[PDB]
Design an enzyme around this catalytic site. Structure first.
Site, short mmCIF file in Angstrom:
data_model
loop_
_atom_site.label_atom_id
_atom_site.label_comp_id
_atom_site.label_asym_id
_atom_site.label_seq_id
_atom_site.Cartn_x
_atom_site.Cartn_y
_atom_site.Cartn_z
N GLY A 234 6.38 4.28 3.58
CA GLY A 234 7.94 4.74 3.28
C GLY A 234 8.63 3.53 2.40
CE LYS A 235 4.64 1.58 -1.70
NZ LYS A 235 5.44 1.87 -2.66
CB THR A 236 9.42 6.52 -2.52
OG1 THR A 236 9.30 7.54 -1.35
CG2 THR A 236 8.37 6.17 -2.90
CD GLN B 240 -7.51 2.47 -11.17
OE1 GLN B 240 -5.86 2.01 -10.93
NE2 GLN B 240 -7.84 3.33 -10.41
CE1 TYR C 165 -5.41 8.82 -4.29
CE2 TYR C 165 -6.37 8.69 -2.43
CZ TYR C 165 -5.35 8.39 -3.05
OH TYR C 165 -4.62 7.32 -2.74
N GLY D 199 1.85 4.97 1.38
CA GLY D 199 2.28 5.61 2.65
C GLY D 199 2.79 4.71 3.96
NE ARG E 63 2.90 9.95 -2.94
CZ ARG E 63 3.27 8.87 -3.33
NH1 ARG E 63 3.23 8.38 -4.69
NH2 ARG E 63 3.83 8.09 -2.15
NE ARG F 269 6.72 13.15 1.51
CZ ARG F 269 6.20 14.40 1.04
NH1 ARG F 269 6.00 15.16 1.85
NH2 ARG F 269 6.06 14.62 -0.22
CD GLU G 73 4.76 6.32 -6.78
OE1 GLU G 73 4.54 7.66 -6.47
OE2 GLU G 73 4.27 5.42 -6.41
CD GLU H 288 -2.96 10.18 -0.12
OE1 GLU H 288 -1.63 9.75 -0.99
OE2 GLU H 288 -3.03 9.94 0.97
N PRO I 24 0.88 -1.15 -0.16
CG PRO I 24 -0.86 -1.57 1.56
CD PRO I 24 0.55 -2.02 1.04
NE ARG J 38 6.47 5.70 7.75
CZ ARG J 38 6.93 6.18 6.76
NH1 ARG J 38 6.39 6.12 5.78
NH2 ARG J 38 8.12 6.22 6.64
CG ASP K 238 7.73 3.00 -6.25
OD1 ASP K 238 6.78 3.30 -6.70
OD2 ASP K 238 8.13 3.20 -5.05
#
Ligand SMILES: Nc1nc2c(ncn2COC(CO)CO)c(=O)[nH]1
Ligand SMILES: Nc1nc2c(ncn2COC(CO)CO)c(=O)[nH]1
Lengths: 306, 312
Positions: free
Chosen positions: B16-18, B76, B52, B14, B173, B171, B34, B176, B12, B167, B113
């Protein structure tokens, strides 16, 4: 290993492909147009929604961005039956079986349309009407399935006036006689024909983009010189350049044949049989591959065919 | 004969993957970002704001299901194109497995990513689950999921909900808006994906288990992605899935069957997720390459993608 021969009857609508294809059937199975999916399983009268929207756009009742959503979404409903069918049938397809000058196939499959019609051709035609964005078209092209061996595509050659006469008679439910659409789609197919030949003769779009075999101006690549796809300086964004790479790769291994439709259903059906001899067949990947296919075909015809 | 290592950090939004990915790259390694620029300017304008907003309008009751779904399914195909081509242009280069679990170190490690299935399945499902998309359309996408290339290591991540929420609450987006309903939907959806992959690897069959609706024991089908497709819409009066839909599910199992799912816990410091992910990486399947010159090629298109669709 048994050999299979797949034939995708494709081309613009209204030329009597169906009327002749049935006359061929009633060794051979025939996968019909998925009308019931378009009309009921996938949504509700997709064909009508498609034609209405273009019409409402054609009359200014709605915007070209609004029509774009609806047009893009429908194309997702229109091409699914073809995608599942290709994804499920792909495992059974082995490799080229010394096609032509070989033996008679254990099984012939006549599909009504190839996934490119719904994934490439129609959306191309829809953009050309101001209903689809070229980015959206390139989105469907990126999703085009790898080209399995023995993809024989039969496209049709019909004179306009005659295509305008047959078209009128065979109108799908919810379909409106849009002559421009008739024109945009026949152009698209003509170019599709030229592209495969352009490619099969060693044509590099990237080499010719700065503008024997056909000339790039006579190929699908022409439609991609759209202001939306280029950088502030005209350089094609790479995202789009790559999609074009995909397109070029998908099409060159396709085997295309032409069926002159300007004639009686008997004539059409007869000819269609003739073309069968120069077609590329394939070895089914396993013993049970043949019968498994038969049922996909029958179960399809039975559930979706209308 | 050089080898390639591909890693797809999905899960998902949010968590902290990036960042972790950025950190890991700072320690050869190539990072495929991304395509945010494709998402808000190139492909369509401010697509995230649309997604959104539209769900919000749907939710507020200013938009109807058909109106929103129509808007959501277009969004999509747009969101997924970058990944789709990337996969297709990458494809001809990937060769057979090689292995990592006690095997030499790759010549190139690509950290992507997300993975196409993010765009072609997880999010679409979450939206179906939100009521802004239809099962048929989710299945249409599933049919288009590209064939799985060998050595597709997918890192999914964990975080307790409560921490996932704070989280997310931070931050921002662009476009969003804190839609907590979606957040949970997305978490269930990636939860099931982990299970589905594990379900299918433990020999499980959906047809065999239809009537009931490794990294642990075999999961109950009702805990796999399949449980999402028991909707009237897809039901024939006979009570069975119309074949069309049933063939879509057959592909979903062919596609997810050969993936290598790994979990990375994001409930920790950034340097640690980095070190932690640097660890999982030790036992991730490797693939050879087809033309030696694939390494430079794969390397350059990875950089091109970045310079043109990244950061935004
Ligand atoms: N995929 C796609 N197919 C379309 C479209 N319009 C028309 N057809 C196909 O033609 C119909 C009859 O008009 C059935 O043969 C369209 O927008 N997309
Ligand atoms: N494809 C798709 N992606 C979505 C969606 N919502 C969120 N994302 C992706 O998350 C964004 C910011 O929330 C950055 O990737 C959605 O409905 N569809």
């Amino acid at each position: 290993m048994p050999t299979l021969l797949r034939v995708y009857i494709d081309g613009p609508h209204g030329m009597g492909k169906t009327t002749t294809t049935q006359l061929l059937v009633a060794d051979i199975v025939y996968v019909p147009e998925p009308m019931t999916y378009w009309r009921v399983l996938g949504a509700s009268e997709t064909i009508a929604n498609i034609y209405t929207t273009q019409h409402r756009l054609d009359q200014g009742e709605i915007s070209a961005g609004d029509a774009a959503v609806v047009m893009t979404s429908a194309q997702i409903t229109m091409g699914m039956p073809y995608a599942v069918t290709d994804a499920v049938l792909a495992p059974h397809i082995g490799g080229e079986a010394g096609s032509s000058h070989a033996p008679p196939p254990a099984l012939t499959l006549i599909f009504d349309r190839h996934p490119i019609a719904a994934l490439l051709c129609y959306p191309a035609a829809r953009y050309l009407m101001g209903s689809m964005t070229p980015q959206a078209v390139l989105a469907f092209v990126a999703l085009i399935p790898p080209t399995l061996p023995g993809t024989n595509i039969v496209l049709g050659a019909l004179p306009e006036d005659r295509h305008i006469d047959r078209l009128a008679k065979r109108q799908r439910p919810g379909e409106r006689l849009d002559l421009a659409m008739l024109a945009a789609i026949r152009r698209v197919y003509g170019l599709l024909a030229n592209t495969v030949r352009y490619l099969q003769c060693g044509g590099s779009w990237r080499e010719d983009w700065g503008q024997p075999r056909p000339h790039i101006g006579d190929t699908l690549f022409t439609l991609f010189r759209a202001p939306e796809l280029l950088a502030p300086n005209g350089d094609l964004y790479n995202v789009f350049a790559w999609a074009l790479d995909v397109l070029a790769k998908r099409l060159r291994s396709m085997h295309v044949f032409i069926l002159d439709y300007d004639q009686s259903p008997a004539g059409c059906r007869d000819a269609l049989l003739q073309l069968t001899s120069g077609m590329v067949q394939t070895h089914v990947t396993t013993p049970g591959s043949i019968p498994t296919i038969c049922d996909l075909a029958r179960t399809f015809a039975r559930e979706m065919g209308e």
